[PDB]
Design a protein around this ligand. Structure first.
Ligand SMILES: CCCCCCCCCCCCCCCCCC(=O)OC[C@H](COP(=O)([O-])OCC(O)COP(=O)([O-])OC[C@@H](COC(=O)CCCCCCCCCCCCCCCCC)OC(=O)CCCCCCCCCCCCCCCCC)OC(=O)CCCCCCCCCCCCCCCCC
Ligand SMILES: CCCCCCCCCCCCCCCCCC(=O)OC[C@H](COP(=O)([O-])OCC[N+](C)(C)C)OC(=O)CCCCCCCCCCCCCCCCC
Ligand SMILES: CCCCCCCCCCCCCCCCCC(=O)OC[C@H](COP(=O)(O)OCCN)OC(=O)CCCCCCCCCCCCCCCCC
Ligand code: SF4
Ligand code: SF4
Lengths: 172, 49, 155, 44, 218, 198, 113, 126, 51
């Protein structure tokens, strides 16, 4: 398969062997490929919501399979575990659940594959790509956190918390 | 097969090998390929299995 | 008998020429010793390939007319220099290359069917029709002072 | 015509034989002279 | 294009010796020997001539064995090109050639009486392609309209001179100074004090240059 | 005018099911012809162009898109007729234009396509013209165009780990993020931006 | 009567060419006429360029060949250009030496009263 | 001063000429490198020096319908290669520099006043 | 309808190799079809000097 994900795009086990003798093999799913990606063709158009949902599920599965490799190569394993990163990106996808245009979904899947490939080949910076794996309402695991506003504004509603803390600087 | 394709068959002509192996563009696909109904990868039908 | 309905004459066209250019003006383009024979061959092959397109389609009619024109012109001319003076006053090699390119369009047009309509034509025509119309503006419109709003009283 | 001989646009038209001789080479290279000379000299 | 041309062929000039503009020695038999070399097939493609010759044999033997590229280029570059005098301009002690139009450091000018030329018309602010000029205006207690703020971000400026062209009283100018290198980013935030002192320091040269430029149309 | 000109009318002769709308203007070169093309025939039309005689010696010069959802005449609003090409910029969500040059006919040909679907989907021609790869990639990333049957759909000029279409009219030229160095992380991060205004 | 054209005329409007011969599917001779016209236009548009197209150049090419240390010496036009430059310099030098002086612009602070 | 620059630019261009053009290393580094024909030259939208190297005669200044700014009414040459490689592009660039010098000279001549007033007797300039 | 003449697949290419040319010129030679190719045409003086 003349593609970056092809079954023959694996790194050889040794300099004289693709795998052990008597057989062949290689890992192309949980790690990056041997040759670099040179083209990423368009997603085949989806005629209904079922195909788009299948595309989303398969993209999420590929992302989940690639999480541990990304965490290891980017040195971000202490901020969150693999499962936490999967859950955060699933929260992202859930926030994108209301989509109902299959062409828009194909475009989004193309963009997601592109960003995943950028992450897995050290094109992007870890402090930049971590914005998609970060928790929504929880502190990161690599540092301490402040619970001051939890104690002072204990039972107060969201409106009161946003009223006591302004929305603009006060010097001017 | 190479001679039928048009590859160089002499030492002197090999200097232009690329002109016969890379510089020729691939033919564009027919529009019937775009007008297909399903685009799933092929697999064996296991009805009787 | 018309030339396009006349069997290909190997002896008439495959004749050496004593007046050929030293070279073409293009890199990796070789002078063709017998260009008229090649033109006749490509024209006949084009007609045979068109034999599969529906006869009522304008693609077939247009291509057949152009091929007939080219065949008549190249048959009536025996000197390559005047033939090259026709067809854009350039190297005949470019013309032959482009005509060989013309060969494949017959296969490419079978699966595209320019003679058959498509489901999306109606929306395109509607949006074409909508675009061109008189476009007045809200200002420059006459507004008069409304009459007094008479008050209504309940019983 | 400024790019062909005897053009009125050209200015230096009078006798410039001395300047033309001084500014440009006066001998034509002939193939094989250096090759034959150098090879024979090297062998000897 | 927009005119007619009955004859598109530009005929060659008259070649007769009787003609007034006859140019002898235009064609040199020693130099113009292109008829010798024009029939070579090597100049038209990848093809080879019908017959090779011992002249080509000798040329190849000379090129491959003697290797003239190590003595031709070496001598002809090294010795001769090193004989030429140097081109260096001693920067601390000499300056490169400029012009009175040179666009350098911005300055605000004054009338010969000491009055500010700038009347806060804000044409220079809208003329700036980089949006580097900020102006605020209040009526001065004597009644004249003057800026209470006129500042230029020199890190935004592209040194294009659109502002000095837009000024209708020649208030803002680009001076001849280019040695304005700063150690802090805040040293390049030019306020009215800086531009005014730049004008008060560089006034003679700016006046001379502007005098010449004004006299040019006259 | 003062030169030999002919319309590219054979294109609509072969494609018998298409309306023909062509323009010539003195604001363009005297050999430049502009035509309107429906979106559902673009791939077949390019297939015909690439191979048909007196069209085969053609090259793709330029490709881009126009966001006409905010197109308004600012002056001379009463000097518009039904034949003006700008009359097709109204009520139309998106426009796409391609510009080619033909060496045999020595002609410039511009083709305009009206996109009226919200997802902005159109077939790609980078399998026919090798120019269209980078051009279409840049157009797709700038204007959100969804190209189908494209060789490469990756971003061309935009930054990593970002999804945006900066050339839409809704987008402000200052963007939404800024890049700063973070001491607490010893690496560059992106933050919501506060910018100066003139 | 409502439209200005016959029902068999497909030319809604033609300002570019003002053509009176519509191309129609029914009339096959119109296709032949259009083909003849387009080939004639091909020949004529390629027969009007002053530099791009030249059959005489195709049959009698003129080449530039590098043969000496001087790039200009391989072409008479460049030699003529160099001689013209020297001629202009000599004329300027003699014309300026004849006068004996050179007027100059001298600054005047009286300009700034 | 522009004419002075042109006269000395001839010499500087010859100086660059004699270390590169006939150099064996330069020829072995540039000849038959990156060779392409007109078909690629059309597929990838190549224009300018690259298009003149692929063999195509395409100059916007010399085009009848596409010329601009006095170019159509001058007299200069343009150069096309016959191999479509790096050597052709190098030679074309050098020759284009020379022709640019020629065009500048022609323009200066077009804004020049050559003839003068001569005395009725003795044909002496005044 | 008469059968059209056959066109080779490698035919219609812009340029030809040695065996392709051999296919094309089966009845003739290079000189009879293409003409004569000349390397260099030295003048009488140059030839005399070379000898
Ligand atoms: C430092 C040393 C060099 C100082 C001078 C530098 C200089 O002026 O260089 C240019 C000067 C002129 O040669 P050119 O620029 O190649 O002339 C090109 C012309 O187009 C003329 O083209 P051409 O090829 O006809 O040139 C005439 C030919 C004249 O040669 C002949 O006439 C050959 C005569 C023998 C012919 C075959 C018979 C052999 C048996 C006898 O000149 C040469 O062969 C030049 C000498 C070649 C290298 C010799 C190295 C010796 C160590 O060349 C040399 O000086 C080369 C080195 C000469 C060393 C001394 C020889 C006595
Ligand atoms: C020490 C340097 C000796 C050579 C000096 C010189 O200029 O030689 C030029 C000559 C020029 O030789 P040439 O014949 O190769 O150069 C003239 C021909 N063109 C310019 C077209 C390439 O070089 C030699 O003679 C070779 C070096 C000496 C070999 C013994
Ligand atoms: C360089 C060749 C050359 O000139 O050599 C010098 C030679 C004279 O020297 P030689 O031969 O040793 O005679 C005894 C006196 N020294 O010179 C001669 O004998 C002149 C003739 C040399 C002929 C052979 C050259 C090789
Ligand atoms: S352009 Fe001149 S006059 Fe106007 S606000 Fe600026 S400095 Fe003042
Ligand atoms: S020189 Fe140009 S960019 Fe700089 S302040 Fe003036 S107008 Fe703005």
């Amino acid at each position: 398969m003349n593609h970056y994900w092809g079954s023959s795009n694996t790194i050889p086990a040794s300099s004289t062997q693709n795998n052990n003798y008597f057989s062949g093999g290689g890992n192309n799913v949980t790690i990056r490929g041997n040759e670099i990606m040179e083209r990423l063709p368009s997603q085949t158009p989806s005629q209904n919501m079922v195909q788009a949902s299948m595309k989303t599920l398969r993209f999420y599965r590929k992302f989940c399979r690639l999480i541990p490799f990304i965490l290891r190569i980017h040195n971000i394993g202490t901020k969150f575990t693999a499962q936490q990163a999967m859950i955060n990106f699933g929260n992202y996808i859930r926030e994108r659940n209301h989509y109902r245009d299959p062409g828009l979904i194909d475009h989004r899947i193309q963009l997601g594959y592109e960003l995943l490939y950028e992450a897995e080949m050290h094109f992007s910076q870890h402090t930049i790509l971590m914005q998609y794996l970060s928790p929504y309402n929880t502190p990161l695991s690599d540092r301490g956190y402040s619970y001051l506003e939890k104690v002072k504004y204990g039972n107060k509603s969201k409106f009161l918390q946003g009223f006591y803390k302004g929305n603009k600087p006060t010097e001017f | 097969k190479m001679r039928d394709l048009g590859f160089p068959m002499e030492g002197e002509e090999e200097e232009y090998i690329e002109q016969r192996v890379f510089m020729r563009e691939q033919l564009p696909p027919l529009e019937s390929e775009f007008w297909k109904k399903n685009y799933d990868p092929y697999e064996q039908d296991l009805f009787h299995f | 008998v018309p030339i396009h309905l006349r069997p290909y004459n190997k002896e008439k066209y495959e004749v050496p020429s004593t007046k050929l250019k030293y070279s073409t003006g293009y890199a990796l383009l070789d002078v063709e010793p017998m260009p008229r024979a090649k033109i006749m061959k490509i024209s006949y092959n084009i007609l045979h390939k068109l034999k599969e397109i529906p006869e009522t389609a304008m693609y077939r009619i247009y291509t057949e007319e152009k091929v007939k024109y080219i065949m008549k012109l190249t048959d009536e001319i025996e000197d390559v220099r005047q033939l090259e003076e026709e067809f854009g006053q350039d190297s005949i090699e470019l013309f032959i290359y482009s005509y060989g390119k013309e060969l494949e369009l017959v296969e490419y047009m079978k699966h595209s069917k320019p003679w058959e309509s498509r489901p999306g034509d109606e929306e395109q025509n509607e949006m074409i029709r909508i675009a061109s119309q008189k476009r007045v503006y809200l200002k420059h419109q006459r507004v008069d002072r409304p009459a007094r709003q008479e008050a209504a009283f309940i019983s | 015509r400024a790019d062909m001989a005897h053009s009125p646009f050209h200015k230096a038209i009078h006798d410039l034989e001395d300047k033309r001789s001084k500014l440009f080479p006066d001998r034509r290279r002939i193939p094989g002279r250096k090759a034959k000379l150098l090879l024979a000299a090297s062998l000897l | 294009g927009y005119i007619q041309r009955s004859n598109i062929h530009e005929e060659a000039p008259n070649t007769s010796v009787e003609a007034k503009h006859h140019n002898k020695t235009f064609y040199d038999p020693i130099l113009d020997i292109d008829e010798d070399l024009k029939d070579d097939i090597r100049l038209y493609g990848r093809d080879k001539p019908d017959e090779l010759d011992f002249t080509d044999v000798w040329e190849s033997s000379y090129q491959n064995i003697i290797c003239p590229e190590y003595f031709y280029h070496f001598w002809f570059c090294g010795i001769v090109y090193s004989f030429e005098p140097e081109w260096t301009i001693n920067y601390p002690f000499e300056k490169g050639p400029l012009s009175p139009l040179f666009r350098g450091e911005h300055a605000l000018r004054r009338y010969p009486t000491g009055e500010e030329r700038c009347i806060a018309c804000k044409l220079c602010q809208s003329a700036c392609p980089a949006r580097a000029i900020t102006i605020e205006t209040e009526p001065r207690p004597d009644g004249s309209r003057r800026t209470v703020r006129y500042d230029i971000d020199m890190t935004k400026c592209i040194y294009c001179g659109f502002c000095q062209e837009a000024c209708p009283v020649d208030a803002i100018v680009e001076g001849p100074n280019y040695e304005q290198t700063a150690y802090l980013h805040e040293d390049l935030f030019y306020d009215k004090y800086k531009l005014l002192e730049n004008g008060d320091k560089w006034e003679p040269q700016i006046a001379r240059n502007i005098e010449y430029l004004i006299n040019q149309p006259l | 005018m003062q030169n030999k000109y002919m319309q590219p009318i054979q294109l609509f002769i072969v494609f018998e099911k298409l309306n023909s709308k062509m323009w010539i203007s003195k604001k363009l070169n005297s050999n430049h012809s502009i035509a309107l093309i429906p979106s559902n025939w673009f791939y077949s039309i390019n297939l015909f162009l690439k191979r048909e005689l007196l069209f085969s010696n053609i090259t793709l010069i330029e490709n881009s898109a126009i966001d006409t959802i905010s197109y308004n005449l600012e002056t001379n609003q009463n000097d518009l007729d039904k034949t003006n090409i700008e009359n097709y910029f109204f009520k139309n969500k998106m426009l796409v234009f391609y510009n080619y040059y033909n060496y045999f006919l020595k002609s410039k040909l511009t083709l305009f396509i009206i996109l009226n679907n919200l997802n902005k989907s159109i077939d790609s021609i980078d399998r026919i013209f090798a120019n269209a790869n980078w051009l279409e990639r840049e157009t797709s990333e700038m204007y959100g165009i969804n190209y189908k049957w494209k060789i490469d759909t990756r971003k061309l000029l935009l930054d990593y780990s970002k999804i945006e279409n900066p050339m839409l009219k809704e987008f402000q030229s200052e963007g939404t993020q800024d890049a700063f160095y973070n001491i607490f992380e010893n690496q560059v991060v992106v933050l919501k931006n506060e910018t100066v205004e003139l | 009567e409502k439209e200005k054209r016959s029902p068999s005329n497909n030319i809604i409007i033609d300002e570019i060419s003002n053509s009176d011969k519509p191309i129609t599917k029914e009339n096959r001779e119109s296709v032949a006429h259009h083909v003849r016209q387009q080939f004639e236009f091909f020949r004529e548009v390629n027969a009007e360029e002053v530099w791009s197209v030249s059959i005489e150049e195709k049959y009698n090419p003129e080449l530039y060949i590098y043969k000496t240390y001087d790039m200009a010496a391989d072409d008479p036009v460049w030699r003529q250009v160099k001689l013209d430059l020297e001629w202009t310099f000599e004329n300027i030098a003699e014309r300026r030496e004849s006068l004996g002086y050179m007027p100059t612009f001298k600054g005047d602070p009286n300009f700034w009263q | 001063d522009i004419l002075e620059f042109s006269r000395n630019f001839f010499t500087t261009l010859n100086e660059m000429h004699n270390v590169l053009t006939y150099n064996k290393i330069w020829k072995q580094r540039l000849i038959n490198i990156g060779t392409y024909s007109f078909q690629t030259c059309l597929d990838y939208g190549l224009t300018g020096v690259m298009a003149r190297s692929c063999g195509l005669k395409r100059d916007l200044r010399l085009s009848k319908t596409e010329t601009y700014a006095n170019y159509y009414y001058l007299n200069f040459r343009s150069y096309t290669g016959q191999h479509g490689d790096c050597y052709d592009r190098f030679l074309i660039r050098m020759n284009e520099m020379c022709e640019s010098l020629n065009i500048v000279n022609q323009s200066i001549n077009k804004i020049s006043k050559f003839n003068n007033i001569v005395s009725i007797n003795t044909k002496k300039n005044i | 309808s008469p059968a059209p003449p056959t066109i080779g697949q490698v035919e219609l290419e812009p340029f030809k190799f040695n065996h392709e040319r051999d296919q094309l010129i089966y009845g003739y030679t290079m000189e009879e079809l293409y003409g004569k190719k000349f390397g260099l045409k030295h003048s009488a003086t140059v030839l005399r000097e070379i000898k």
